[PDB]
CSV table of C-alpha atoms and ligand atoms in Angstrom, one decimal:
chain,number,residue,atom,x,y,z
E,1,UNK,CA,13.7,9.1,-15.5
E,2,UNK,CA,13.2,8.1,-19.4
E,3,UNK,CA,12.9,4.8,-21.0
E,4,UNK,CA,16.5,4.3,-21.8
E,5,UNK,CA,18.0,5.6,-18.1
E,6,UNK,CA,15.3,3.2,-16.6
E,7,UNK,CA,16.8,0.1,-18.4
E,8,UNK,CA,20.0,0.6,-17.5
E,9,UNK,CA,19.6,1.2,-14.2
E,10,UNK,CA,17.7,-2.0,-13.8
E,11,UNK,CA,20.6,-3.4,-15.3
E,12,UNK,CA,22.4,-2.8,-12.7
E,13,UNK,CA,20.3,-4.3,-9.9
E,14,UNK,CA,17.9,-7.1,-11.6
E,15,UNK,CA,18.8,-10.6,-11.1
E,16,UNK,CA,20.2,-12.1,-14.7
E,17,UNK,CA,18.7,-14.4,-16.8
E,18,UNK,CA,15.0,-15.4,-17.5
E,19,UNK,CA,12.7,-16.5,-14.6
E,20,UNK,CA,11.1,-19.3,-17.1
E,21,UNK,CA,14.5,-21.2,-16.9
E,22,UNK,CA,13.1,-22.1,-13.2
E,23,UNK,CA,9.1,-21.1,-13.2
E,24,UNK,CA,6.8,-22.9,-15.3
E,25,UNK,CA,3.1,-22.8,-15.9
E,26,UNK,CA,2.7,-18.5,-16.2
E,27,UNK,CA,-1.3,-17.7,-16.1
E,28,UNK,CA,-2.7,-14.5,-15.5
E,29,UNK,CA,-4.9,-13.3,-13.3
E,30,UNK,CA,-5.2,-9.8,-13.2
E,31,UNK,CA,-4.1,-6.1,-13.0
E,32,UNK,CA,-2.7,-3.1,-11.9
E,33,UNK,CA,-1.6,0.2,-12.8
E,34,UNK,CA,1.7,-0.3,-14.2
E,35,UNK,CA,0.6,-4.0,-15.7
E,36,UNK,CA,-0.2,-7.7,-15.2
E,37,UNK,CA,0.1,-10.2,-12.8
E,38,UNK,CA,0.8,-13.8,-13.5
E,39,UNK,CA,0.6,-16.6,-11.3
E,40,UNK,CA,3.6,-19.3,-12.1
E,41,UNK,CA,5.2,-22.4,-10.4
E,42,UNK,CA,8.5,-22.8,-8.8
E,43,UNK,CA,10.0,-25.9,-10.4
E,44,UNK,CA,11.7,-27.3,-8.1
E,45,UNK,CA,9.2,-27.0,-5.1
E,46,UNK,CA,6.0,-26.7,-6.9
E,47,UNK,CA,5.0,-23.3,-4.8
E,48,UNK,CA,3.2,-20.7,-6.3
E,49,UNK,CA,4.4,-17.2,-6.9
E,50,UNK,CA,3.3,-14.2,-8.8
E,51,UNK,CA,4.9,-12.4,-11.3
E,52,UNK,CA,4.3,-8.6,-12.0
E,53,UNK,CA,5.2,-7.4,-15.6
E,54,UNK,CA,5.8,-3.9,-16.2
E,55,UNK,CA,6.5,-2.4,-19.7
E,56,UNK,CA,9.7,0.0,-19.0
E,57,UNK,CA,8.5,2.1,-22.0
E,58,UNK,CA,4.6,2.8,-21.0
E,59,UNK,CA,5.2,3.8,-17.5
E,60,UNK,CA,5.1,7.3,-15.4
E,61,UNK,CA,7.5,8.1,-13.1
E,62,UNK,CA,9.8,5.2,-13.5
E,63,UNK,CA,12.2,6.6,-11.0
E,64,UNK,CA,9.4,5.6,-8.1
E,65,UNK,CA,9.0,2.2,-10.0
E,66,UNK,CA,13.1,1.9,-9.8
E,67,UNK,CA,13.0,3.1,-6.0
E,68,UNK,CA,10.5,0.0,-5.2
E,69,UNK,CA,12.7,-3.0,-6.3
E,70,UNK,CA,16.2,-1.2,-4.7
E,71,UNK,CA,14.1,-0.4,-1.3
E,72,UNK,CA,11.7,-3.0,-1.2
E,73,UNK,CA,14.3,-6.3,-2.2
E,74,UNK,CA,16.0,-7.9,0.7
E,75,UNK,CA,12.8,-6.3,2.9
E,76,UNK,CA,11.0,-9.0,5.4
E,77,UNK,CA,8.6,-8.4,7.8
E,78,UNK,CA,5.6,-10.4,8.4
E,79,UNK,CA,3.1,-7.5,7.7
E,80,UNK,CA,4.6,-6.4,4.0
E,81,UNK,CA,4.4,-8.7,0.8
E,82,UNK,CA,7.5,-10.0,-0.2
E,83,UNK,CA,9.6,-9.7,-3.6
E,84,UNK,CA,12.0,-12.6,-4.3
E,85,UNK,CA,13.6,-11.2,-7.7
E,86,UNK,CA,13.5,-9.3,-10.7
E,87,UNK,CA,14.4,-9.9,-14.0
E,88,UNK,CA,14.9,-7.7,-17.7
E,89,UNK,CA,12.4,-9.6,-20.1
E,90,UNK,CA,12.6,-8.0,-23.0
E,91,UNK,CA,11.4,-4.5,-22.5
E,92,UNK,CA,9.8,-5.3,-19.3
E,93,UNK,CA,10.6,-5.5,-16.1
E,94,UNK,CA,9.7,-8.5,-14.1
E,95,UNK,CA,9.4,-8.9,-10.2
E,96,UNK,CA,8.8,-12.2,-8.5
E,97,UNK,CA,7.2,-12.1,-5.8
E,98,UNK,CA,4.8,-14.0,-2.9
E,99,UNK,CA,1.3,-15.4,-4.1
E,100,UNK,CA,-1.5,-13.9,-1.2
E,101,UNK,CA,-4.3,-15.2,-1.6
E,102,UNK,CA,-7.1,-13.8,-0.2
E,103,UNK,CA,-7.1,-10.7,-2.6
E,104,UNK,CA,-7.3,-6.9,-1.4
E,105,UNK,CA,-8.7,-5.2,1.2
E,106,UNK,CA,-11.2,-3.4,-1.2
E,107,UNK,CA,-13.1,-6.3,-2.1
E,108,UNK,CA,-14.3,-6.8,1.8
E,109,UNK,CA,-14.9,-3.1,2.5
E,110,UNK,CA,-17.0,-2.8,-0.7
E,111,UNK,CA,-19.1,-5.7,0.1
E,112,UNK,CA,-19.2,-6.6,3.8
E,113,UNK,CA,-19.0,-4.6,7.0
E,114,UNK,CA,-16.1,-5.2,9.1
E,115,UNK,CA,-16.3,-5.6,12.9
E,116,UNK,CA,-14.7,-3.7,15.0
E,117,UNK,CA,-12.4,-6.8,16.0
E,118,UNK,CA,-11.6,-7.5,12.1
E,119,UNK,CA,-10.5,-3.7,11.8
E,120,UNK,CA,-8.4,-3.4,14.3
E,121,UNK,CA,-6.1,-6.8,12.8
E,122,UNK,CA,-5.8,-4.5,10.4
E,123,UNK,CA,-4.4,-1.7,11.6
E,124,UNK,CA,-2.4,-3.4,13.9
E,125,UNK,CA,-0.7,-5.3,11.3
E,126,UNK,CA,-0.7,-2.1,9.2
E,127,UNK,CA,1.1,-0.2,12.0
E,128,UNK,CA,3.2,-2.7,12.7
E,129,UNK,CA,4.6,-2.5,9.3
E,130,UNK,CA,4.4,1.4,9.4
E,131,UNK,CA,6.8,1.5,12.9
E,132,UNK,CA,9.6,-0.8,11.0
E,133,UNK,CA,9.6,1.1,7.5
E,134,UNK,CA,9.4,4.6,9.3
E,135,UNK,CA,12.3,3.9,11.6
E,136,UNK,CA,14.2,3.4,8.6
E,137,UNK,CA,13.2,6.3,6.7
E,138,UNK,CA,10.9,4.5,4.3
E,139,UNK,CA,7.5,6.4,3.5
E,140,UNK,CA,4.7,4.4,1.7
E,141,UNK,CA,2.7,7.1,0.2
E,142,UNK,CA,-0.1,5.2,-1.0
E,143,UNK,CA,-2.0,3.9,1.7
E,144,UNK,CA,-5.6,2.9,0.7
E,145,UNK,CA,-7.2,-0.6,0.7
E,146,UNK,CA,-6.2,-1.1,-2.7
E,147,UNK,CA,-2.7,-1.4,-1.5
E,148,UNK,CA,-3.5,-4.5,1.4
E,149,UNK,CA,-2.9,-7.6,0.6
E,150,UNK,CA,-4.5,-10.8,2.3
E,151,UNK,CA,-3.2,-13.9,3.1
E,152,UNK,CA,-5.3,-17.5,2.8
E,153,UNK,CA,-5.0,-17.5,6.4
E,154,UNK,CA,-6.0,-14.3,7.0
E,155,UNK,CA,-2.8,-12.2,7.6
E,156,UNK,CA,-2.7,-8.6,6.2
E,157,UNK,CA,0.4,-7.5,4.4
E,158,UNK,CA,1.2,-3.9,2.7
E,159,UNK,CA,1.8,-3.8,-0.7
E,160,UNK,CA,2.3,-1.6,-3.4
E,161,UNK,CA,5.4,0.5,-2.9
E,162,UNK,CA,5.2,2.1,-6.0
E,163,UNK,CA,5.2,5.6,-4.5
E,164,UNK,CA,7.6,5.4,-1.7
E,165,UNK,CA,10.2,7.2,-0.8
E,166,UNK,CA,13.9,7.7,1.5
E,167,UNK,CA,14.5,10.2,3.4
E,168,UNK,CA,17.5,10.7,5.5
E,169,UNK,CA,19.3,13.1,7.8
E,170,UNK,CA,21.2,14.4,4.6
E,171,UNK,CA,17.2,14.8,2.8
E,172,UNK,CA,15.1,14.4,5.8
E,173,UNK,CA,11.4,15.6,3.9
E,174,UNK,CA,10.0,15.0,0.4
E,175,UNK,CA,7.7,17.8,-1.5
E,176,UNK,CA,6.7,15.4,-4.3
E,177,UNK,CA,2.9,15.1,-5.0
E,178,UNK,CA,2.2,11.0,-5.0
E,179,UNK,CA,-0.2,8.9,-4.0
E,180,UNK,CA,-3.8,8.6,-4.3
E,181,UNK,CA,-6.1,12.0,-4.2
E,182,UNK,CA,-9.0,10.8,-1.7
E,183,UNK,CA,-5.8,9.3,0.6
E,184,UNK,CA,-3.6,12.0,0.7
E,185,UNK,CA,-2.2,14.1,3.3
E,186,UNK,CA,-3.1,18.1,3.5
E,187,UNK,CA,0.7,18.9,4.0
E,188,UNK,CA,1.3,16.4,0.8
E,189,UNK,CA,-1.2,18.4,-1.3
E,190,UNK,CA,0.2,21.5,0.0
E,191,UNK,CA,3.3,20.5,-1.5
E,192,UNK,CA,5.0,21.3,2.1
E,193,UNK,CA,8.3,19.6,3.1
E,194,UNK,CA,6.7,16.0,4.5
E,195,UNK,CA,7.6,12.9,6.5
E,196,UNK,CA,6.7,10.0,7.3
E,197,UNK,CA,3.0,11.4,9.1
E,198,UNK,CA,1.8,11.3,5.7
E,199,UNK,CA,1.1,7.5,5.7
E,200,UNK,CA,-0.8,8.1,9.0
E,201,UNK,CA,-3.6,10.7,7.9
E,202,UNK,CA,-3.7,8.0,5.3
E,203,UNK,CA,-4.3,5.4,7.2
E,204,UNK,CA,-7.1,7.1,8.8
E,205,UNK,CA,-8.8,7.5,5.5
E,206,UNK,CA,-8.7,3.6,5.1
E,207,UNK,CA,-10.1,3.3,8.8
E,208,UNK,CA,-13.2,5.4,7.0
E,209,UNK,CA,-13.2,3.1,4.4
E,210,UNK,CA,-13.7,0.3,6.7
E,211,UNK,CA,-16.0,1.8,8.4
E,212,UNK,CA,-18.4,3.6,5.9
E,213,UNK,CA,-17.5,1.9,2.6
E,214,UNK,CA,-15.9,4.5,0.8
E,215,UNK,CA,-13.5,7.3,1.8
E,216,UNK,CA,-14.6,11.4,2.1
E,217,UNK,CA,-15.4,13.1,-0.8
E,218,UNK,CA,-15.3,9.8,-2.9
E,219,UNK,CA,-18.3,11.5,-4.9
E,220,UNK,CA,-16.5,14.1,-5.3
E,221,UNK,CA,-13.8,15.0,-8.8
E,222,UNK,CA,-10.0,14.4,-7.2
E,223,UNK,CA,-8.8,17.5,-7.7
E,224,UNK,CA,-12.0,18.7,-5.5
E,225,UNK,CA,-11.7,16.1,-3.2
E,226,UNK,CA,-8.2,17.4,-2.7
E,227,UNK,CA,-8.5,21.2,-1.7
E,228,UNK,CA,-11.4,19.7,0.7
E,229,UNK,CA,-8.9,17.7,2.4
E,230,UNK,CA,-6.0,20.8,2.1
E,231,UNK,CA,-7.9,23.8,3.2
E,232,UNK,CA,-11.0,22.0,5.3
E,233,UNK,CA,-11.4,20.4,8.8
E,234,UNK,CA,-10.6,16.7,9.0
E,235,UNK,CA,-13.1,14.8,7.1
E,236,UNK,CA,-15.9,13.1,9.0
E,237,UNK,CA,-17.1,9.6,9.4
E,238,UNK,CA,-20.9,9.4,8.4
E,239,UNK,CA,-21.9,6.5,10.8
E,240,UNK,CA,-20.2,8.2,13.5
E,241,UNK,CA,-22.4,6.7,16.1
E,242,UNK,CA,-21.5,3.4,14.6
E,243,UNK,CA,-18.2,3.7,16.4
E,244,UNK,CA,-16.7,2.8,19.8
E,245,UNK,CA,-15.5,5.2,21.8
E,246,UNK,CA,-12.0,3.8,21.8
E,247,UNK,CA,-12.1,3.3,17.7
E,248,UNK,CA,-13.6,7.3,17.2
E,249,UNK,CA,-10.3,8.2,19.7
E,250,UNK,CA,-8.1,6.1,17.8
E,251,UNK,CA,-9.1,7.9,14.4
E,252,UNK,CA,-8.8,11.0,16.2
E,253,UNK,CA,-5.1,10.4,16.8
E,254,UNK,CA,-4.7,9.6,12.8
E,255,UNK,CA,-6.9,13.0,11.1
E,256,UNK,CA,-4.9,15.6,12.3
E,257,UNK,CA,-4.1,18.1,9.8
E,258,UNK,CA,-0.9,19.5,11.8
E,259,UNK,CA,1.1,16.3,11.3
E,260,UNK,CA,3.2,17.3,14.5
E,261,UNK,CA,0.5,16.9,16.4
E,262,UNK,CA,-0.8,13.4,14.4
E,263,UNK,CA,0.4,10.1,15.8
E,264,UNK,CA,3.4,8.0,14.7
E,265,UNK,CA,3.4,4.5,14.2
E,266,UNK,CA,5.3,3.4,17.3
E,267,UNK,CA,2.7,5.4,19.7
E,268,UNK,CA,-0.6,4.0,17.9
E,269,UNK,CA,0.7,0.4,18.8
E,270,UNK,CA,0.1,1.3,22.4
E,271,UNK,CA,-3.6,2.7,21.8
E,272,UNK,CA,-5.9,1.2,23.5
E,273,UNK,CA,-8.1,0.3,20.2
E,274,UNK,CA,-5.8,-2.3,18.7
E,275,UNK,CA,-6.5,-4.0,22.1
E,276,UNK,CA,-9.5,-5.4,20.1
E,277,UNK,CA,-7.4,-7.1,17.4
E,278,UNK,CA,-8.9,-10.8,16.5
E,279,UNK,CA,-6.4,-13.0,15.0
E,280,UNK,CA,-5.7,-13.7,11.9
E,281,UNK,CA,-8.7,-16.6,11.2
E,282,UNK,CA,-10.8,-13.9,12.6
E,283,UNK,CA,-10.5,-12.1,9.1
E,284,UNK,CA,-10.6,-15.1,6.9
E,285,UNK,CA,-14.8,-15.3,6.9
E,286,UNK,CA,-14.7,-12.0,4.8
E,287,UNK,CA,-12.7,-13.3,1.9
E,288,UNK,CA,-14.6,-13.7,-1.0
E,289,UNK,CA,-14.0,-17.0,-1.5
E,290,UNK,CA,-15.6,-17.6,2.1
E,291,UNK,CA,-18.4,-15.4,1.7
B,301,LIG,C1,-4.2,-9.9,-9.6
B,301,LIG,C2,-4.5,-10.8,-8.4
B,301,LIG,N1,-3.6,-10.9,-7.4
B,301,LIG,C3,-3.8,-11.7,-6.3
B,301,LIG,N2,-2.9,-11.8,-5.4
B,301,LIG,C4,-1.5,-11.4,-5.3
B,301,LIG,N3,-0.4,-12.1,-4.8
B,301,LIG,N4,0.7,-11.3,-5.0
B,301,LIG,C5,0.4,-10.2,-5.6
B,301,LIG,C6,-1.0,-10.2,-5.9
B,301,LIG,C7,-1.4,-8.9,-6.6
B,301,LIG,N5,0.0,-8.2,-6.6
B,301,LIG,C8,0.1,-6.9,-6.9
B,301,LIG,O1,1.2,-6.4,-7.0
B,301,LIG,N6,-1.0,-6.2,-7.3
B,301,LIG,C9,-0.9,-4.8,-7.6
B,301,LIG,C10,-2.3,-4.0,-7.5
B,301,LIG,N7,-2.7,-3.8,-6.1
B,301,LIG,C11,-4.1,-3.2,-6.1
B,301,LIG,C12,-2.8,-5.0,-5.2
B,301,LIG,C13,-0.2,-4.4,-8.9
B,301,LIG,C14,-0.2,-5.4,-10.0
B,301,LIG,C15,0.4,-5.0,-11.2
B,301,LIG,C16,0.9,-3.7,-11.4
B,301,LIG,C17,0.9,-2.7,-10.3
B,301,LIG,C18,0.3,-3.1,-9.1
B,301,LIG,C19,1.2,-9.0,-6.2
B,301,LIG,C20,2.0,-8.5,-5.0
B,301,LIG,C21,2.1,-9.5,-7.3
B,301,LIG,C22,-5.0,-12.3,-6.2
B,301,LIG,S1,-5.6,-13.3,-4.9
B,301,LIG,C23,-7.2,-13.6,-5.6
B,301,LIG,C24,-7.2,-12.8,-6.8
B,301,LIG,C25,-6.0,-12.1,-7.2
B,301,LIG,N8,-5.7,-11.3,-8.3
C-alpha cells in the first residue's frame, strides 16, 4: 500500500476533524516504531488519553497499519488496550487511545524476576485475550513483552496490533512474514500457510522471557536466531530447574513446532498453571514506579 492509497483509505474510516478541538495539553512521552506518543486531556472530563502519531509517508507496510485501526476500533475486552478514534492531521495519522500506566512488560522482565504467581496473571489475561480475538479470526503476530501493556492497577492488556491479521473461511491461513524474529513461529518463518497457533509458540517465547530475562538466541543475529527456531528443536529455558512442574508443562503445551499439535487459547485456560494467577495488585509491586 503506498502513501497516497494509505490516505485515502483512512479517509474513509478516520473520525473527522482535529482531536485538539476537544483534547488539550499534548505532551510527549515516548516512542515506538511507527512514531510518538503524546499524553493529552479530555476537555470535558479532564481524563487522560494517549495519542499515537504516525507519519503516513515514513512507514512500512501501511496496509498492516490500515488493518489495526479497521480491526482493532469498536474492539473491548478487558485484557486488550483500547482505541477511542482516529483522526487525519496533516500527513499523519492519529489514534486516540487509553492512557496505561504502568508501562510495558519489558521493563519488569529486564529488571526484576517475576514469581510464578505474577506470571501466570499474565498469561491468563494474555490468553484470555488470545481465546476472544482467535474465535474471531484475528491473529496478533507480534507477541513479545514489548507489546503488554500495564495498567496502574496492575491489569495486563495486549497491545500493538500492528501486525495482525483476518482470516476467514473464504482465506482461512496467512503466508506473510511479520512479527518479531526471536518471537516468531517455525511454520511463520517457513513461510507455510499459518493460523492463529502462531501467537501461541509466541507466547511461549515471552513465558522465557519472564522466566530467564531474555528470549532464545537473543545473542544471536535475527536472521540466525530465525533458522534456529525454523529447522531446530524447541528452544530451551536455561533456569529450567527454576520452574514448577505445572509451569515447565504449561510451556510444553506452547513450544511445539507442529502447531496441530500446540495448544489453542481456549484449552490453555483450563491448564492447571494459570491456577496460580495472583490478582491484579499482585503485579503492581514490579512497576517501576513501585520498585
Ligand atoms: C510511551 C509511553 N507510553 C505509556 N503508556 C501508554 N498508554 N497507552 C499507550 C501507551 C504506549 N502506547 C503504544 O502504542 N506504544 C507502542 C509501543 N509499544 C512498545 C508499547 C507504540 C507507540 C508509537 C508507535 C508504535 C507503537 C499506547 C497504546 C498509545 C507509558 S506509561 C509510563 C511510561 C510510558 N511511556
Amino acid at each position: 500500500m503506498s502513501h497516497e492509497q494509505f490516505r485515502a483509505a483512512l479517509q474513509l474510516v478516520v473520525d473527522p476533524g482535529d482531536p485538539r478541538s476537544y483534547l488539550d495539553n499534548f505532551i510527549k512521552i515516548g516512542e515506538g516504531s511507527t512514531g510518538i506518543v503524546c499524553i493529552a486531556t479530555v476537555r470535558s472530563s479532564g481524563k487522560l488519553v494517549a495519542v499515537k502519531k504516525m507519519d503516513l509517508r515514513k512507514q512500512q507496510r501501511r496496509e498492516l497499519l490500515f488493518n489495526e485501526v479497521v480491526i482493532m476500533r469498536d474492539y473491548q475486552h478487558e485484557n486488550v488496550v483500547e482505541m477511542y478514534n482516529s483522526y487525519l492531521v496533516g500527513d499523519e495519522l492519529w489514534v486516540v487511545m487509553e492512557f496505561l500506566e504502568g508501562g510495558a512488560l519489558t521493563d519488569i522482565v529486564t529488571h526484576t524476576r517475576m514469581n510464578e504467581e505474577q506470571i501466570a496473571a499474565v498469561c491468563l489475561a494474555v490468553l484470555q485475550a488470545l481465546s476472544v480475538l482467535h474465535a474471531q479470526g484475528v491473529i496478533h503476530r507480534d507477541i513479545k513483552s514489548d507489546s503488554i501493556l500495564l495498567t496502574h492497577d496492575g491489569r495486563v492488556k495486549l497491545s500493538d496490533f500492528g501486525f495482525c491479521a483476518q482470516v476467514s473461511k473464504e482465506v482461512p491461513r496467512r503466508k506473510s512474514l511479520v512479527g518479531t524474529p526471536y518471537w516468531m513461529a517455525p511454520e511463520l518463518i517457513s513461510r507455510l500457510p499459518y493460523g492463529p497457533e502462531v501467537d501461541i509458540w509466541s507466547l511461549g517465547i515471552m513465558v522465557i522471557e519472564m522466566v530467564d530475562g531474555e528470549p532464545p538466541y537473543f545473542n544471536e543475529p535475527p536472521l540466525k536466531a530465525m533458522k534456529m527456531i525454523r529447522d531446530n528443536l524447541p528452544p530451551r529455558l536455561k533456569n529450567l530447574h527454576k520452574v514448577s512442574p505445572s509451569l515447565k508443562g504449561f510451556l510444553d503445551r506452547l513450544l511445539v513446532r507442529d502447531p496441530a499439535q500446540r495448544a489453542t487459547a481456549a484449552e490453555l485456560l483450563k491448564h492447571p498453571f494459570l491456577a496460580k494467577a495472583g490478582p491484579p495488585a499482585s503485579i503492581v509491586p514490579l512497576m517501576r514506579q513501585n520498585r
